[PDB]
């Protein structure tokens, strides 16, 4: 009666890559907020970027789109945003409709633009820092440790052996006169928002053509990455996790018109949610960096899926967890929005030609 369905973006013809990506970004609370409050008078953070003005326009056009989503405009047509994106990143103007594109490539370029415009305020929420150990496979006294590698996502490598996301994340942290060196990353700083890429798209050698790995790879709703951290950082994050678990457990224990009553209940539920956020926050570590995850645990909040033979075919969708009711998920099939249950989300692990998870977004536990 009173609860309104979220709205989606109309597909202009092979532009579901953009639509699914925008829903996932909109779900990231801090990002949504900084875009919604962006004032062009504020300029950009990185005015070393030669194309500064077009990045600012990308943000402006995102803000307009986000204003239309927030204020539910039954359908949003991101025409000007697409044109703007194409001016900045001509790869997205390739034809053959315009050609279908890899959502990962869009995600990456949008991250670049948002980093130019907002700076550290944006990028610190996503930064993963590594401690890298570099050993000569032929000599285990030749050891070098580096602390300066970082990224804004983790890659989940998928081969025929891969059955769970953890398997692929662990493989992604390792790689290999001249010698073969093993290069082994452990995480020394976790972000509050953790993006995971399933490496599904690849160049098939046999056919000289783009293809896709269809293998089922199970992801968890609650992700714990303690085993990917340096020993020193794990000790810190596990201590936090164990206090947060105690709060979670304690939480699980505990004349107006009909419209007015609904609006009062929403207000009550938001207050109760905020009181629990404050209870978790009491246990956050004292020297936590802005944008850093307090613990080593995350909850899943969004999934970008793809169905089709390769990154230039088929269809992308987003599945987004409701911000209050953690059991509720929304399916954004462009402008067709529906409510689905946890079982439908689990089925996105893949296997065969089914719609399957490509990019996963996790938010830190207790946030």
From Swiss-Prot:
* Assembly description: Associates with the regulatory particle (RP) of the proteasome.
Natural source organism: Saccharomyces cerevisiae (strain ATCC 204508 / S288c) (Baker's yeast)
The miscellaneous annotation reads: Present with 6770 molecules/cell in log phase SD medium.
Which residues are recorded with the post-translational modification Phosphoserine? 338
Name recorded for this polypeptide: Ubiquitin carboxyl-terminal hydrolase 6
Described purpose of this protein according to its UniProt entry: Predominant proteasome-associated deubiquitinase which releases ubiquitin from the proteasome targeted ubiquitinated proteins. Ensures the regeneration of ubiquitin at the proteasome. Has proteasome-inhibitory activity and delays the degradation of ubiquitinated proteins to provide a time window allowing gradual deubiquitination of the substrate. Stabilizes the association of HUL5 with proteasomes and works in opposition to polyubiquitin elongation activity of HUL5.
Q: What is known of its domains?
A: The N-terminal ubiquitin-like domain is required for proteasome association and UBP6 activation at the proteasome.
**Compositionally biased spans, kind Basic and acidic residues:** 249-254
Choose any GO biological process term that the UniProt entry carries and state it: regulation of proteasomal ubiquitin-dependent protein catabolic process
Q: Give the UniProt keywords, A-Z.
A: Hydrolase, Phosphoprotein, Protease, Thiol protease, Ubl conjugation pathway
Give residues where Phosphothreonine occurs: 257
Q: How does activity depend on pH?
A: Optimum pH is 8.5-9.
Q: Which residues of the full protein are shown?
A: 103 to 499 of 499
């Amino acid at each position: 009666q009173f609860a309104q369905l979220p709205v989606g973006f109309k597909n202009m013809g092979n532009t579901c890559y953009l639509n699914a990506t925008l829903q996932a970004l909109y779900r990231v609370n801090d990002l949504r907020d900084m875009i919604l409050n962006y004032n062009p008078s504020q300029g950009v953070s990185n005015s070393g970027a030669q194309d500064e003005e077009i990045h600012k326009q990308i943000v402006i056009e995102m803000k307009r789109c986000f204003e239309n989503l927030q204020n539910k405009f039954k359908s949003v047509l991101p025409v000007v945003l697409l044109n703007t994106l194409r001016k900045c990143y001509p790869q997205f103007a390739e034809r053959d409709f315009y050609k279908q594109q890899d959502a990962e490539e869009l995600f990456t370029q949008l991250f670049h633009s948002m980093s130019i415009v907002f700076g550290d305020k944006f990028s610190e929420d996503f930064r993963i820092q590594f401690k890298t150990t570099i050993k000569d496979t032929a000599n285990d006294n030749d050891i070098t440790v580096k602390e300066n590698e970082s990224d804004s996502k983790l890659q989940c490598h998928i081969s025929g052996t891969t059955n769970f996301m953890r398997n692929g994340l662990l493989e992604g942290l390792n790689e290999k006169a001249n010698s073969i060196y093993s290069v082994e990353k452990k995480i020394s700083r976790l972000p509050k928002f953790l993006t995971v890429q399933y490496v599904r798209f690849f160049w098939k050698r046999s056919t000289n053509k783009k293809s896709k790995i269809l293998r089922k790879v199970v992801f968890p709703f609650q992700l714990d990455v303690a085993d990917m951290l340096t020993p020193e950082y794990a000790a810190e994050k596990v201590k936090v996790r164990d206090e947060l678990r105690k709060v979670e457990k304690e939480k699980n224990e505990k004349v107006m018109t009909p419209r007015e009553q609904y609006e009062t209940q929403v207000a009550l539920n938001e207050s109760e949610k905020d009181q629990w956020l404050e209870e978790y926050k009491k246990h956050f570590p004292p020297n936590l960096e802005k944008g850093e995850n307090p613990s080593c645990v995350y909850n899943l909040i969004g999934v970008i899926t793809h169905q089709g033979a390769n990154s230039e075919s088929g269809h992308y969708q987003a599945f987004i967890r409701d911000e209050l009711d953690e059991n509720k998920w929304y399916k954004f099939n462009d402008d067709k929005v529906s409510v689905v249950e946890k079982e439908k989300i689990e089925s996105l692990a893949g296997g065969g030609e089914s719609d399957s998870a490509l990019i996963l977004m996790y938010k830190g536990f207790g946030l």
